[PDB]
Design a protein around this ligand. Structure first.
Ligand SMILES: [Ca+2]
Length: 426
Protein backbone atom coordinates (compact mmCIF):
# COMPACT_ATOMS: atom_id res chain seq x y z
CA UNK A 1 0.00 0.00 0.00
CA UNK A 2 0.91 3.65 0.43
CA UNK A 3 3.50 5.10 2.87
CA UNK A 4 2.54 8.41 4.43
CA UNK A 5 4.74 10.63 6.62
CA UNK A 6 4.03 13.00 9.52
CA UNK A 7 6.45 15.46 11.14
CA UNK A 8 6.25 18.07 13.95
CA UNK A 9 6.77 20.76 11.30
CA UNK A 10 4.58 19.20 8.63
CA UNK A 11 1.20 20.42 7.48
CA UNK A 12 -2.21 18.79 7.24
CA UNK A 13 -2.58 20.67 3.89
CA UNK A 14 0.36 18.62 2.54
CA UNK A 15 -0.15 15.36 0.64
CA UNK A 16 1.78 13.40 3.32
CA UNK A 17 4.82 12.50 1.26
CA UNK A 18 8.38 12.28 2.61
CA UNK A 19 9.15 15.79 1.23
CA UNK A 20 5.77 17.25 2.34
CA UNK A 21 4.68 15.38 5.49
CA UNK A 22 1.40 15.73 7.40
CA UNK A 23 1.29 17.41 10.86
CA UNK A 24 -1.16 15.22 12.83
CA UNK A 25 -2.71 11.77 13.23
CA UNK A 26 -6.16 13.36 12.69
CA UNK A 27 -5.21 13.88 9.03
CA UNK A 28 -3.59 10.42 8.82
CA UNK A 29 -6.89 8.89 10.02
CA UNK A 30 -8.75 10.68 7.25
CA UNK A 31 -6.70 8.99 4.45
CA UNK A 32 -5.46 5.55 5.57
CA UNK A 33 -6.85 2.25 4.31
CA UNK A 34 -5.91 -1.38 4.92
CA UNK A 35 -2.28 -1.99 3.96
CA UNK A 36 -1.10 1.62 4.38
CA UNK A 37 1.77 2.68 6.60
CA UNK A 38 2.42 5.98 8.35
CA UNK A 39 6.04 6.71 9.17
CA UNK A 40 6.05 9.11 12.17
CA UNK A 41 9.16 11.27 12.17
CA UNK A 42 11.06 11.73 15.45
CA UNK A 43 10.66 14.86 17.61
CA UNK A 44 7.96 16.18 19.91
CA UNK A 45 4.36 16.60 18.76
CA UNK A 46 2.60 18.93 21.16
CA UNK A 47 -1.13 18.29 20.84
CA UNK A 48 -2.77 21.76 20.79
CA UNK A 49 -4.95 22.71 23.77
CA UNK A 50 -7.84 23.52 21.41
CA UNK A 51 -7.67 20.45 19.12
CA UNK A 52 -11.21 19.05 19.01
CA UNK A 53 -11.52 15.43 20.20
CA UNK A 54 -11.89 12.91 17.39
CA UNK A 55 -14.69 11.34 19.43
CA UNK A 56 -16.24 11.11 22.89
CA UNK A 57 -17.48 8.11 24.90
CA UNK A 58 -19.69 7.40 27.94
CA UNK A 59 -22.26 10.17 27.41
CA UNK A 60 -19.51 12.81 26.90
CA UNK A 61 -17.41 11.86 29.94
CA UNK A 62 -14.39 11.04 27.74
CA UNK A 63 -12.49 13.35 25.44
CA UNK A 64 -10.78 10.96 22.97
CA UNK A 65 -7.82 12.62 21.29
CA UNK A 66 -7.16 10.08 18.52
CA UNK A 67 -9.87 7.62 17.45
CA UNK A 68 -8.24 4.53 15.97
CA UNK A 69 -11.46 3.62 14.25
CA UNK A 70 -10.40 2.26 10.86
CA UNK A 71 -9.37 -1.34 10.41
CA UNK A 72 -6.87 -3.26 8.40
CA UNK A 73 -7.45 -6.82 7.17
CA UNK A 74 -5.69 -10.09 8.12
CA UNK A 75 -2.26 -9.86 6.37
CA UNK A 76 -2.93 -6.17 5.47
CA UNK A 77 -2.77 -4.16 8.68
CA UNK A 78 -2.84 -0.41 9.02
CA UNK A 79 0.54 0.49 10.57
CA UNK A 80 1.58 3.56 12.58
CA UNK A 81 5.37 3.30 12.96
CA UNK A 82 8.22 5.47 14.13
CA UNK A 83 10.17 6.32 10.95
CA UNK A 84 12.86 3.57 10.78
CA UNK A 85 15.03 5.80 8.53
CA UNK A 86 15.47 8.51 11.21
CA UNK A 87 17.06 8.04 14.62
CA UNK A 88 15.13 8.93 17.76
CA UNK A 89 11.61 8.34 19.00
CA UNK A 90 8.51 10.33 18.23
CA UNK A 91 7.02 11.86 21.45
CA UNK A 92 3.34 12.84 21.70
CA UNK A 93 3.13 15.51 24.45
CA UNK A 94 -0.42 15.69 25.83
CA UNK A 95 0.27 18.24 28.61
CA UNK A 96 -1.86 21.04 27.07
CA UNK A 97 -5.04 18.95 26.59
CA UNK A 98 -7.20 19.86 29.61
CA UNK A 99 -10.91 19.73 28.62
CA UNK A 100 -13.15 20.78 31.51
CA UNK A 101 -15.00 17.96 33.32
CA UNK A 102 -13.74 15.21 31.02
CA UNK A 103 -11.53 12.18 31.34
CA UNK A 104 -8.85 11.87 28.65
CA UNK A 105 -8.18 8.88 26.35
CA UNK A 106 -5.25 9.61 24.03
CA UNK A 107 -5.62 6.57 21.72
CA UNK A 108 -9.20 5.16 21.73
CA UNK A 109 -8.98 1.84 19.86
CA UNK A 110 -12.16 0.43 18.28
CA UNK A 111 -10.53 -0.87 15.03
CA UNK A 112 -8.93 -4.19 14.20
CA UNK A 113 -5.77 -5.36 12.38
CA UNK A 114 -3.73 -2.36 13.51
CA UNK A 115 -0.01 -2.19 14.26
CA UNK A 116 1.41 0.69 16.40
CA UNK A 117 5.14 0.86 17.12
CA UNK A 118 8.03 2.85 18.50
CA UNK A 119 6.66 6.11 19.96
CA UNK A 120 5.96 7.69 23.38
CA UNK A 121 2.95 9.35 25.03
CA UNK A 122 3.89 11.84 27.78
CA UNK A 123 2.07 14.38 29.90
CA UNK A 124 -1.43 12.95 29.65
CA UNK A 125 -3.58 14.94 32.08
CA UNK A 126 -6.20 14.46 34.75
CA UNK A 127 -8.25 17.60 35.55
CA UNK A 128 -11.20 16.06 37.40
CA UNK A 129 -10.70 16.27 41.14
CA UNK A 130 -12.93 13.39 42.30
CA UNK A 131 -12.10 9.69 41.79
CA UNK A 132 -11.23 9.43 38.13
CA UNK A 133 -8.81 8.19 35.50
CA UNK A 134 -7.30 8.98 32.12
CA UNK A 135 -5.68 6.47 29.70
CA UNK A 136 -2.98 6.64 27.04
CA UNK A 137 -4.52 3.59 25.26
CA UNK A 138 -8.08 2.33 25.86
CA UNK A 139 -9.03 -0.76 23.86
CA UNK A 140 -12.68 -1.98 23.75
CA UNK A 141 -15.06 -4.67 22.48
CA UNK A 142 -14.64 -5.33 18.78
CA UNK A 143 -11.05 -4.14 18.60
CA UNK A 144 -9.33 -7.38 17.54
CA UNK A 145 -5.99 -8.67 16.23
CA UNK A 146 -3.95 -5.60 17.05
CA UNK A 147 -0.28 -5.27 17.92
CA UNK A 148 1.10 -2.55 20.20
CA UNK A 149 4.92 -2.78 20.17
CA UNK A 150 7.80 -0.82 21.76
CA UNK A 151 5.48 1.98 22.93
CA UNK A 152 6.20 4.02 26.07
CA UNK A 153 3.53 5.70 28.18
CA UNK A 154 5.32 7.78 30.78
CA UNK A 155 5.71 10.98 32.78
CA UNK A 156 1.98 11.61 32.83
CA UNK A 157 -1.16 11.21 34.97
CA UNK A 158 -2.76 8.42 32.92
CA UNK A 159 -2.95 4.66 32.94
CA UNK A 160 -0.69 3.35 30.19
CA UNK A 161 -2.71 0.55 28.57
CA UNK A 162 -6.30 -0.19 29.56
CA UNK A 163 -8.26 -3.12 28.07
CA UNK A 164 -12.05 -3.21 28.54
CA UNK A 165 -12.69 -5.60 25.63
CA UNK A 166 -11.31 -6.97 22.37
CA UNK A 167 -9.54 -10.15 21.40
CA UNK A 168 -6.01 -11.07 20.32
CA UNK A 169 -4.46 -7.74 21.35
CA UNK A 170 -0.70 -8.21 21.85
CA UNK A 171 1.01 -5.56 24.01
CA UNK A 172 4.67 -6.28 23.33
CA UNK A 173 7.88 -4.72 24.68
CA UNK A 174 6.03 -1.67 26.04
CA UNK A 175 7.02 0.51 29.04
CA UNK A 176 4.70 2.35 31.42
CA UNK A 177 6.58 4.42 34.01
CA UNK A 178 6.59 7.58 36.13
CA UNK A 179 2.78 7.83 36.03
CA UNK A 180 1.13 9.70 38.88
CA UNK A 181 -2.11 11.74 39.13
CA UNK A 182 -1.18 14.87 41.09
CA UNK A 183 -4.63 16.48 40.68
CA UNK A 184 -7.48 14.15 41.62
CA UNK A 185 -8.41 13.43 45.23
CA UNK A 186 -5.85 15.86 46.63
CA UNK A 187 -3.29 14.37 44.20
CA UNK A 188 -1.65 11.49 46.15
CA UNK A 189 -0.85 9.54 43.05
CA UNK A 190 -4.20 7.91 43.24
CA UNK A 191 -5.16 5.04 41.11
CA UNK A 192 -2.73 4.95 38.13
CA UNK A 193 -1.69 1.53 36.87
CA UNK A 194 0.85 0.80 34.14
CA UNK A 195 -1.16 -1.90 32.37
CA UNK A 196 -4.78 -2.89 33.07
CA UNK A 197 -6.60 -5.96 31.78
CA UNK A 198 -10.34 -5.61 32.49
CA UNK A 199 -12.22 -7.48 29.72
CA UNK A 200 -15.88 -6.74 30.56
CA UNK A 201 -19.12 -8.77 30.38
CA UNK A 202 -20.00 -7.23 27.01
CA UNK A 203 -16.81 -8.62 25.48
CA UNK A 204 -16.88 -12.27 26.63
CA UNK A 205 -16.46 -15.20 24.31
CA UNK A 206 -13.93 -17.02 22.16
CA UNK A 207 -12.53 -14.53 19.60
CA UNK A 208 -14.33 -11.63 21.36
CA UNK A 209 -12.43 -11.26 24.68
CA UNK A 210 -9.80 -14.02 24.56
CA UNK A 211 -6.14 -14.04 23.57
CA UNK A 212 -4.96 -10.72 25.04
CA UNK A 213 -1.32 -10.83 26.18
CA UNK A 214 1.14 -8.45 27.85
CA UNK A 215 4.68 -9.65 26.89
CA UNK A 216 8.17 -8.23 27.43
CA UNK A 217 6.68 -5.13 29.16
CA UNK A 218 8.08 -3.10 32.06
CA UNK A 219 6.03 -1.10 34.62
CA UNK A 220 7.77 1.05 37.23
CA UNK A 221 6.89 4.08 39.40
CA UNK A 222 3.20 3.86 38.57
CA UNK A 223 1.27 5.23 41.56
CA UNK A 224 -0.92 2.16 42.04
CA UNK A 225 0.02 -1.21 40.44
CA UNK A 226 2.32 -2.25 37.56
CA UNK A 227 -0.16 -4.71 36.09
CA UNK A 228 -3.80 -5.09 37.24
CA UNK A 229 -6.30 -7.74 36.04
CA UNK A 230 -9.27 -6.95 38.33
CA UNK A 231 -12.77 -7.43 36.83
CA UNK A 232 -11.39 -9.39 33.87
CA UNK A 233 -14.00 -11.78 32.38
CA UNK A 234 -11.64 -13.77 30.07
CA UNK A 235 -8.11 -15.02 30.84
CA UNK A 236 -5.27 -12.55 30.30
CA UNK A 237 -1.60 -13.61 30.24
CA UNK A 238 1.40 -11.64 31.52
CA UNK A 239 4.62 -13.21 30.10
CA UNK A 240 8.26 -12.09 30.52
CA UNK A 241 7.26 -8.79 32.17
CA UNK A 242 9.07 -6.77 34.87
CA UNK A 243 7.14 -4.78 37.52
CA UNK A 244 9.08 -2.78 40.07
CA UNK A 245 8.89 0.31 42.32
CA UNK A 246 5.13 0.72 41.87
CA UNK A 247 3.16 2.33 44.72
CA UNK A 248 5.62 5.21 45.15
CA UNK A 249 5.72 8.81 43.87
CA UNK A 250 8.08 8.66 40.89
CA UNK A 251 11.79 8.67 41.76
CA UNK A 252 11.06 8.50 45.52
CA UNK A 253 9.97 6.21 48.35
CA UNK A 254 7.03 8.50 49.21
CA UNK A 255 3.83 6.49 49.68
CA UNK A 256 1.40 6.63 46.78
CA UNK A 257 -1.15 3.86 45.89
CA UNK A 258 -1.40 0.14 46.46
CA UNK A 259 2.03 -0.88 45.15
CA UNK A 260 1.47 -4.36 43.68
CA UNK A 261 3.78 -5.74 40.95
CA UNK A 262 1.14 -8.02 39.41
CA UNK A 263 -2.47 -7.91 40.65
CA UNK A 264 -3.58 -11.03 38.75
CA UNK A 265 -7.31 -11.38 39.40
CA UNK A 266 -10.28 -10.38 41.53
CA UNK A 267 -13.80 -8.94 41.28
CA UNK A 268 -13.58 -6.65 44.32
CA UNK A 269 -14.57 -6.88 47.96
CA UNK A 270 -17.56 -4.53 48.10
CA UNK A 271 -19.68 -4.73 51.29
CA UNK A 272 -22.89 -3.27 49.80
CA UNK A 273 -23.57 -5.48 46.74
CA UNK A 274 -22.34 -8.50 44.78
CA UNK A 275 -20.10 -7.74 41.78
CA UNK A 276 -20.89 -8.98 38.28
CA UNK A 277 -18.77 -12.10 37.67
CA UNK A 278 -18.00 -14.17 34.58
CA UNK A 279 -19.76 -17.55 34.25
CA UNK A 280 -16.30 -19.15 33.90
CA UNK A 281 -13.77 -17.84 36.47
CA UNK A 282 -10.72 -17.32 34.24
CA UNK A 283 -7.32 -18.82 34.93
CA UNK A 284 -5.15 -15.71 34.42
CA UNK A 285 -1.41 -16.41 34.08
CA UNK A 286 1.77 -14.65 35.16
CA UNK A 287 4.82 -16.50 33.75
CA UNK A 288 8.60 -15.83 33.50
CA UNK A 289 8.15 -12.44 35.13
CA UNK A 290 10.00 -10.36 37.75
CA UNK A 291 8.72 -8.27 40.71
CA UNK A 292 11.16 -5.97 42.54
CA UNK A 293 10.54 -3.50 45.37
CA UNK A 294 6.91 -2.72 44.76
CA UNK A 295 5.69 -0.96 47.87
CA UNK A 296 3.39 -3.72 49.23
CA UNK A 297 3.17 -6.90 47.12
CA UNK A 298 4.85 -8.81 44.29
CA UNK A 299 2.56 -11.43 42.70
CA UNK A 300 -0.99 -11.15 44.10
CA UNK A 301 -4.15 -13.19 43.44
CA UNK A 302 -6.11 -10.06 44.54
CA UNK A 303 -9.19 -11.82 45.94
CA UNK A 304 -9.78 -13.99 42.87
CA UNK A 305 -12.73 -16.41 42.79
CA UNK A 306 -10.69 -19.33 41.41
CA UNK A 307 -7.23 -20.49 40.41
CA UNK A 308 -4.52 -18.55 38.63
CA UNK A 309 -1.16 -19.75 37.30
CA UNK A 310 2.08 -18.28 38.74
CA UNK A 311 4.91 -20.15 36.93
CA UNK A 312 8.69 -19.51 36.75
CA UNK A 313 8.66 -16.03 38.33
CA UNK A 314 11.22 -14.21 40.47
CA UNK A 315 10.38 -11.81 43.33
CA UNK A 316 12.91 -9.68 45.17
CA UNK A 317 12.06 -7.47 48.15
CA UNK A 318 8.52 -6.70 46.97
CA UNK A 319 6.68 -6.77 50.29
CA UNK A 320 4.53 -9.91 50.27
CA UNK A 321 6.45 -11.44 47.36
CA UNK A 322 3.68 -13.97 46.67
CA UNK A 323 0.15 -13.47 48.14
CA UNK A 324 -2.44 -16.01 47.02
CA UNK A 325 -5.50 -14.49 48.72
CA UNK A 326 -8.85 -15.46 47.14
CA UNK A 327 -12.35 -14.19 47.89
CA UNK A 328 -14.59 -16.84 49.52
CA UNK A 329 -16.61 -18.85 47.02
CA UNK A 330 -19.51 -18.95 46.46
CA UNK A 331 -19.84 -15.22 46.09
CA UNK A 332 -21.39 -13.92 49.33
CA UNK A 333 -21.93 -10.94 51.64
CA UNK A 334 -20.21 -9.94 53.82
CA UNK A 335 -17.14 -10.33 51.58
CA UNK A 336 -14.41 -12.38 53.21
CA UNK A 337 -11.05 -13.76 52.12
CA UNK A 338 -9.63 -17.27 52.24
CA UNK A 339 -6.21 -18.86 51.64
CA UNK A 340 -5.96 -19.28 47.86
CA UNK A 341 -7.57 -22.34 46.20
CA UNK A 342 -7.11 -23.97 42.75
CA UNK A 343 -3.87 -22.08 42.07
CA UNK A 344 -0.82 -23.47 40.24
CA UNK A 345 2.25 -21.97 42.00
CA UNK A 346 5.32 -23.70 40.49
CA UNK A 347 9.01 -23.03 39.83
CA UNK A 348 9.08 -19.59 41.49
CA UNK A 349 11.99 -17.85 43.21
CA UNK A 350 11.89 -15.43 46.17
CA UNK A 351 14.50 -13.26 47.90
CA UNK A 352 13.79 -11.28 51.11
CA UNK A 353 16.39 -8.85 52.53
CA UNK A 354 14.04 -5.86 52.98
CA UNK A 355 12.28 -4.79 56.20
CA UNK A 356 8.72 -6.11 56.30
CA UNK A 357 9.01 -8.35 53.23
CA UNK A 358 7.80 -11.99 53.22
CA UNK A 359 8.04 -14.95 50.85
CA UNK A 360 4.48 -16.33 50.57
CA UNK A 361 1.20 -15.63 52.36
CA UNK A 362 -2.43 -16.69 52.09
CA UNK A 363 -2.10 -19.93 50.11
CA UNK A 364 -3.93 -23.19 50.82
CA UNK A 365 -1.38 -25.93 49.93
CA UNK A 366 -4.15 -28.56 50.44
CA UNK A 367 -6.34 -26.90 47.74
CA UNK A 368 -3.68 -25.47 45.40
CA UNK A 369 -0.71 -27.09 43.71
CA UNK A 370 2.39 -25.44 45.23
CA UNK A 371 5.63 -27.14 44.14
CA UNK A 372 9.30 -26.57 43.31
CA UNK A 373 9.36 -23.03 44.71
CA UNK A 374 12.40 -21.71 46.49
CA UNK A 375 10.32 -20.78 49.54
CA UNK A 376 9.09 -24.49 49.87
CA UNK A 377 12.69 -25.65 50.42
CA UNK A 378 15.10 -25.87 53.33
CA UNK A 379 17.77 -23.44 52.14
CA UNK A 380 17.02 -19.71 52.46
CA UNK A 381 17.81 -17.68 49.32
CA UNK A 382 20.56 -15.06 49.97
CA UNK A 383 22.24 -12.11 48.17
CA UNK A 384 25.30 -14.10 47.04
CA UNK A 385 23.00 -16.55 45.18
CA UNK A 386 22.67 -13.84 42.52
CA UNK A 387 25.03 -12.53 39.82
CA UNK A 388 23.61 -9.06 40.37
CA UNK A 389 20.90 -7.25 42.38
CA UNK A 390 21.71 -3.80 41.02
CA UNK A 391 18.31 -2.25 40.35
CA UNK A 392 19.44 0.30 37.74
CA UNK A 393 19.92 -2.69 35.37
CA UNK A 394 16.11 -2.97 35.20
CA UNK A 395 15.92 0.61 33.83
CA UNK A 396 18.57 0.08 31.10
CA UNK A 397 17.56 1.16 27.63
CA UNK A 398 15.90 -1.49 25.50
CA UNK A 399 17.81 -2.97 22.60
CA UNK A 400 17.37 -1.16 19.25
CA UNK A 401 14.69 -3.73 18.19
CA UNK A 402 12.72 -3.01 21.39
CA UNK A 403 13.66 -6.19 23.31
CA UNK A 404 14.33 -6.04 27.03
CA UNK A 405 17.92 -5.13 27.99
CA UNK A 406 20.32 -7.87 28.92
CA UNK A 407 20.58 -7.92 32.70
CA UNK A 408 22.16 -10.00 35.44
CA UNK A 409 19.62 -8.64 37.97
CA UNK A 410 17.92 -11.56 39.65
CA UNK A 411 19.89 -14.21 37.75
CA UNK A 412 21.19 -17.11 39.88
CA UNK A 413 24.91 -17.96 39.87
CA UNK A 414 25.91 -21.26 38.29
CA UNK A 415 26.29 -22.83 41.77
CA UNK A 416 23.02 -21.43 43.09
CA UNK A 417 21.18 -22.74 39.99
CA UNK A 418 22.17 -26.28 41.13
CA UNK A 419 20.58 -25.66 44.55
CA UNK A 420 17.40 -24.00 43.15
CA UNK A 421 17.08 -26.07 39.99
CA UNK A 422 14.38 -24.95 37.55
CA UNK A 423 13.32 -21.96 39.70
CA UNK A 424 12.79 -18.32 38.70
CA UNK A 425 12.23 -16.31 35.55
CA UNK A 426 15.81 -16.53 34.13
CA1 LIG B 1 -4.84 -0.81 40.29
Amino acid sequence: GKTYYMDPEGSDSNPGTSDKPFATLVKVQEVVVAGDVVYINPGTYVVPANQVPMTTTNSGLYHCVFHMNKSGEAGKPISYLANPNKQGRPIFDLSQVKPKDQRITVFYVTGSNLYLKGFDVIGTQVTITGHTQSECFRIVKGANNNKFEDLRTHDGMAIGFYLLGGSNNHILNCDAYNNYDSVSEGGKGGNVDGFGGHINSSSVGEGKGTGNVFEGCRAWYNSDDGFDLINCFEAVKIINCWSFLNGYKPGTKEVAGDGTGFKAGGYGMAADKLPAIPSVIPQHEVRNSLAYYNRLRGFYANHHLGGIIFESNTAVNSGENYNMTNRESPLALPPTDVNGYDHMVKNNLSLVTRSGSKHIVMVNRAKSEVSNNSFDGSEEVIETDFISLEEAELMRDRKPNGDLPDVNFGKLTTDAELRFWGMGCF
